[PDB]
Write an enzyme that holds these catalytic residues in place. Structure first.
Site, mmCIF file in Angstrom:
data_model
loop_
_atom_site.group_PDB
_atom_site.id
_atom_site.type_symbol
_atom_site.label_atom_id
_atom_site.label_comp_id
_atom_site.label_asym_id
_atom_site.label_seq_id
_atom_site.Cartn_x
_atom_site.Cartn_y
_atom_site.Cartn_z
ATOM 1 N N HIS A 295 3.529 -3.580 -10.655
ATOM 2 C CA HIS A 295 2.720 -3.433 -9.415
ATOM 3 C C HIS A 295 1.278 -2.997 -9.698
ATOM 4 O O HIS A 295 0.436 -2.984 -8.785
ATOM 5 C CB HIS A 295 3.416 -2.558 -8.373
ATOM 6 N N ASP B 29 9.991 -3.423 -12.264
ATOM 7 C CA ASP B 29 8.583 -3.035 -12.134
ATOM 8 C C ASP B 29 8.031 -2.634 -13.499
ATOM 9 O O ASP B 29 7.827 -1.450 -13.791
ATOM 10 C CB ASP B 29 8.418 -1.907 -11.100
ATOM 11 N N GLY C 259 -1.686 6.726 -7.920
ATOM 12 C CA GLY C 259 -2.619 6.882 -9.043
ATOM 13 C C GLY C 259 -1.925 7.170 -10.364
ATOM 14 O O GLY C 259 -2.508 6.973 -11.416
ATOM 15 N N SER D 97 0.944 5.632 -10.987
ATOM 16 C CA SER D 97 1.681 4.376 -11.176
ATOM 17 C C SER D 97 1.453 3.768 -12.541
ATOM 18 O O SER D 97 0.316 3.708 -13.014
ATOM 19 C CB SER D 97 1.237 3.354 -10.131
ATOM 20 N N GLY D 98 2.535 3.301 -13.156
ATOM 21 C CA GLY D 98 2.464 2.650 -14.461
ATOM 22 C C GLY D 98 2.520 3.596 -15.646
ATOM 23 O O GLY D 98 2.743 3.164 -16.774
HETATM 24 N N1 LIG Z 1 6.847 9.597 -7.321
HETATM 25 C C1 LIG Z 1 6.359 9.199 -6.145
HETATM 26 N N2 LIG Z 1 6.639 9.830 -5.089
HETATM 27 C C2 LIG Z 1 5.485 7.982 -6.095
HETATM 28 C C3 LIG Z 1 5.080 7.407 -7.293
HETATM 29 C C4 LIG Z 1 4.271 6.279 -7.302
HETATM 30 C C5 LIG Z 1 3.864 5.715 -6.100
HETATM 31 C C6 LIG Z 1 3.017 4.507 -6.160
HETATM 32 N N3 LIG Z 1 2.112 4.275 -5.326
HETATM 33 O O1 LIG Z 1 1.389 3.128 -5.489
HETATM 34 C C7 LIG Z 1 0.026 3.091 -5.069
HETATM 35 C C8 LIG Z 1 -0.904 3.457 -6.204
HETATM 36 O O2 LIG Z 1 -0.490 4.127 -7.277
HETATM 37 O O3 LIG Z 1 -2.079 3.133 -6.130
HETATM 38 C C9 LIG Z 1 4.269 6.280 -4.889
HETATM 39 C C10 LIG Z 1 5.087 7.419 -4.881
#
Ligand SMILES: N=C(N)c1ccc(/C=N/OCC(=O)O)cc1
Ligand SMILES: [Ca+2]
Length: 223
Positions: A40, A84, A175, A177-178
């Site tokens: 993603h 993912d 932020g 993510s990944g």
């Molecule tokens: N652990 C969580 N609660 C979590 C982890 C990752 C996300 C991902 N969001 O995507 C949008 C971005 O990163 O820009 C959401 C919640």
């Protein structure tokens, strides 16, 4: 990262920032030429930034290397976030040293209860928005698949696990993510998704890296 701590400069040497004019995702360096991130996080024109602590200040240990190619998992579903995971190849090999280092792939899956280190430059607030400039860290246990499925009915596949705290307050976030979930020196997870951040009964959901080792190795071997 919500409810974590300041890692310390270059203490997480496999942590990368993916940059397209600005930080937008984390990743994990797995050898001198390859990074593992979340599918993603896919976009064109990625520059991989290694050796970062403050992402807004050049501090002296950075390596900035453009990506030559990205490979999204063949079965990635952007709706469900199943599979993912994505590989990113660097245009040139990183120079590996104590502050820029690869992280090992797992040889077996980790179990519920195992403590892991989760890290990133994501939001530090569970309601508001505040982005740190330095790398943040969180120590968190892998949760049981049953509790993960109970938290997120109908959404947890065999390629996902939950880690964190059902009480809330401590989690990865937007932020992050990944970025990596590392357990006993092995990359077991990738920051994937969750409902808000650090919410009660809504732990972080992570891509289950041990499922992808065959695909990662074969892909790297031919690209
Ligand atoms: N652990 C969580 N609660 C979590 C982890 C990752 C996300 C991902 N969001 O995507 C949008 C971005 O990163 O820009 C959401 C919640
Ligand atoms: Ca920097």
């Amino acid at each position: 990262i919500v409810g974590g701590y300041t890692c310390g400069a270059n203490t997480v040497p496999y942590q990368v920032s993916l940059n397209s004019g600005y930080h937008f995702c984390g990743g994990s360096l797995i050898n001198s030429q390859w990074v593992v991130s979340a599918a993603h996080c896919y976009k064109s024109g990625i520059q991989v930034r290694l050796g970062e602590d403050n992402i807004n200040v050049v501090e002296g240990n950075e390596q900035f290397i453009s990506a030559s190619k990205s490979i999204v998992h063949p079965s990635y579903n952007s709706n469900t976030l199943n599979n993912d995971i994505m590989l990113i190849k660097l245009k040139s090999a990183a120079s590996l040293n104590s502050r820029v280092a690869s992280i090992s792939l797992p040889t077996s899956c980790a179990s519920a209860g195992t403590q892991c280190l989760i890290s990133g430059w994501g939001n530090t607030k569970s309601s508001g928005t505040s982005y740190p400039d330095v790398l943040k860290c969180l120590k968190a246990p892998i949760l049981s698949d049953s509790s993960c499925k109970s938290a997120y009915p109908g959404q947890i596949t065999s390629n996902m696990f939950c880690a964190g705290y059902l009480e809330g307050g401590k989690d990865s976030c937007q932020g992050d993510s990944g970025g990596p979930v590392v357990c006993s020196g092995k990359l077991q997870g990738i920051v994937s998704w969750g409902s808000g951040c650090a919410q009660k009964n809504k732990p972080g959901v992570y891509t289950k890296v041990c499922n992808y080792v065959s695909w990662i190795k074969q892909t790297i071997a031919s690209n």
